[PDB]
Design a binder for this molecule. Structure first.
Ligand code: 6RU
Ligand code: 6RU
Ligand code: 6RU
Ligand code: 6RU
Ligand code: 6RU
Ligand code: 6RU
Ligand code: CA
Ligand code: CA
Ligand code: CA
Ligand code: CA
Ligand code: CA
Ligand code: CA
Ligand code: CA
Ligand code: CA
Ligand code: CA
Ligand code: CA
Ligand code: CA
Ligand code: CA
Ligand code: CA
Ligand code: CA
Ligand code: CA
Ligand code: CA
Ligand code: CA
Ligand code: CA
Lengths: 161, 161, 161, 161, 161, 161
């Protein structure tokens, strides 16, 4: 079973959008969101990846309690939120904590309730609504196999460097 | 200058939607929102009102720091968010704290930045997006005079009882 | 399907043990726990009940986000934690929010993961460990039917008054 | 040993100054402080008192963890902060939780460290510095006996009504 | 228009005074303040500066929501709080987030309300009141031009190294 | 008087167990505890130590207000919690902030109230109760001298490397 380290940038419940400078590893405030919205899960990126858009591959991690920005979480994928924004491809791997038996019933995208998946989708569809020249189109859920392959190829691209 | 007491039900930043039972005065959890959204201001209702829809008149209060549910705040109106939902009329009076000189520059709807007003509007336009058979249409900002008249007539309707 | 109002006294995560004075309805700090423990769910009591011990019947409510003390939550039972302490019978009805489709898959005690139920049990087994002359014995989970009957008879006892 | 109920209005760490309407028992936001200061202890008033200034007698309660506004705490006095402000006499009884053995070593004003007492004094000396026509003079610590007598006489004044 | 990176050490609302070790970049707890006061804005220092006192130049950043210690914020100056303490010169650049149109109306020190500026001043005037052998004198607000020049010369001093 | 730097991993009140990767210095989420328990003090490790078990020496730091994970605190020891777990020796040095006169009355293990020491012990005795193949035996408090010697020898072991 695949697993990897996610650096969490943004705790669940946050309207401050934090990024990491990937040169330094410093956490940065990107912006306070222009919409009255809050990240619906802990959000970050997979360490040692180069995604389909030239940045590290983004990840959403389901947690019982949020963490702080910059914290590492060992995670395994169960699906992916596929999307294109003004930046091009901007896919998000849905994960759960690896090696934690309390998540053993969550193996694939169909094991995550529709209410959670719709909520996550709603966030990404709408959070940029009041920023002009920023859209999102092609927004879909895909299964674990598709998530694994995208992580796989983004690990290879990182190594080719 | 008009002023009144607002009972705050929902602090700013909250995804739990609290109501008051107006028979008892008890605070109740209505629901946890189905959208990844958070109340953009402290939200409640004006005491001793009967609004255009038969409930107390709703109010949004701009505060430097949120309060707890059930707290009274003496407030004065500066504008109103006019809207119709599945319940019919569901207008919200925009207020600031009364008798507080730090808010003396905020007198009318044009004294509130567009970014705040758009954010508030976005909340009310979208927070019910994942609840079926719940829409909102006719969503507009109106000035202080219109707010005063609606409070005025809702105070009179309460007294006629 | 049975439902009722729970007044939440103690949010999940709390080490302050709050009670309600049932004469007045005032919230009171009973004590700060003597153990390094925290209420594992939102905790309160069912309004209009007289339990098997002469106090209102206690309830645990599973919520996506905790509420504040004194808030009402409409809830339905899915099981019960049966126990006897130094006070005699001190049973706790396990509930979920009523009329909320996100909880429709949780119908009976077997629909709640063992890790949650063990955690709840551990709290009640151990939280009084450093208070002398306070024990708990006979600690067991029972199903929804048993919970319904105990609520039923505690509603009747309240009415006979 | 004397004890009484304190209704806490303001948790420790707060810059929102909450009051209770003593007619209704409703919690109200008085104001957000004009100084960058925060209440150094949980702050409220003793129920069923009429102090030397015609309001209920104010109390400071030392707690391991703050409570919410409107919560009752059974407390016993260990000293008093004597002061006169623009309102005249505005004394504050220093208390600890009653019937709690973890506070048994705190019996009188000399059992409270000077750093706490200086901090409390500093708050009350300075929190109104940026509100014009509001001063405080005559600010002193006095012992438990003086605190008891002031509670005593304020209970009698309440009863004479 | 000038801009720079501020490393925030202390979120707004905090009574823990955090510093950065500039050798390592580690965040350190300097002390819990001896006064019942709380940092009135997010507080840190400008990266790649050597101020008039041989430490990095301090900055206050006005934010809609505080950040965590160690977070970078791209900021632009609008004024400066000029002061001398027991350490000699200890000036603080007042900033707002750079490239954020919600702050475009805040260009110079006169665009910041007097109530904020007085509050900030009150903090720095009083927070060391209960630490002996620590004073502050010469405390004044100066405009953006003066702030720019001090940043300018502190950047040059850093480069000469 | 001995002092040292503690890197705090876990703030007081936390049910998320954070660790540091000692290779990188990155903070990691180890796990969310399986018990309804919360760290009773701020918890971390002494920098530049190699304890009796081959990891850095663990420390508990008594603070007036918790810090964030990864923050350094200069501390001095007053005692130690001696224990063996499934990992072998897993001792914890009890500390207070160094160079802070508010802690000058806390010099040795007998200056810490029994209620705190029992609470800390209860945490470590019970927090792994629902993780199988994880026990703790031999759990005792020892005085400052014993703490100093263990730090001493763990500093020497770090240097021999
Ligand atoms: C009652 N029911 C079906 C329930 N399932 C879960 C659960 C199943 C698989 C993972 N989780 C999980 C979700 C969120 C946090 C932690 C674990 N969690 C709960 N909780 C009240 C925490 N309830
Ligand atoms: C820098 N500038 C134009 C600014 N204006 C205000 C302000 C003007 C009128 C009311 N408020 C207000 C808004 C929110 C909270 C409190 C007061 N507040 C700030 N703050 C940083 C608090 N900055
Ligand atoms: C991934 N999985 C099985 C999951 N199930 C639930 C869930 C099922 C039934 C009720 N709940 C529930 C539990 C706690 C809070 C809200 C709802 N919730 C989650 N969350 C991450 C919130 N995950
Ligand atoms: C280490 N020492 C002398 C200490 N004393 C107390 C204490 C003595 C009497 C009352 N308290 C008390 C103070 C605040 C909260 C709770 C209890 N508390 C602590 N704590 C770390 C909580 N330490
Ligand atoms: C109603 N009035 C004059 C107002 N102005 C501002 C504002 C103007 C320029 C900057 N800010 C600002 C201040 C603090 C946070 C964010 C933005 N902000 C508010 N808020 C209620 C947030 N109100
Ligand atoms: C009333 N009494 C005996 C008391 N002692 C202390 C105290 C003595 C030595 C250290 N601490 C200390 C403990 C926890 C936090 C900060 C300092 N602290 C308090 N507080 C209410 C903070 N009370
Ligand atoms: Ca990013
Ligand atoms: Ca970006
Ligand atoms: Ca857009
Ligand atoms: Ca309502
Ligand atoms: Ca409703
Ligand atoms: Ca809808
Ligand atoms: Ca109870
Ligand atoms: Ca009790
Ligand atoms: Ca016991
Ligand atoms: Ca008062
Ligand atoms: Ca008043
Ligand atoms: Ca004054
Ligand atoms: Ca500094
Ligand atoms: Ca310093
Ligand atoms: Ca001084
Ligand atoms: Ca560790
Ligand atoms: Ca480990
Ligand atoms: Ca075990």
């Amino acid at each position: 079973a695949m697993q990897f380290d996610v650096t969490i940038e943004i705790p669940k419940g946050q309207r401050n959008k934090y990024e990491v400078d990937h040169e330094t590893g410093r956490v940065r405030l990107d912006r306070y969101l222009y919409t009255p919205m809050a990240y619906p899960t802990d959000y970050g990126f997979i360490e040692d990846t180069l995604g389909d858009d030239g940045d590290p591959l983004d990840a959403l991690v389901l947690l019982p309690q949020p963490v702080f920005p910059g914290v590492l979480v060992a995670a395994r994928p169960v699906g992916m939120f596929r999307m294109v924004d003004e930046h091009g491809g901007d896919d998000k791997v849905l994960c759960v904590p690896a090696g934690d038996p309390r998540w053993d019933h969550v193996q694939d995208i169909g094991d995550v309730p529709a209410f959670e998946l719709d909520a996550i989708k709603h966030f990404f569809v709408h959070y940029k609504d009041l920023e002009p020249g920023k859209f999102v189109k092609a927004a879909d859920w895909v299964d674990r196999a598709e998530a694994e392959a995208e992580v796989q190829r983004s690990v290879e691209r990182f190594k080719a460097g």
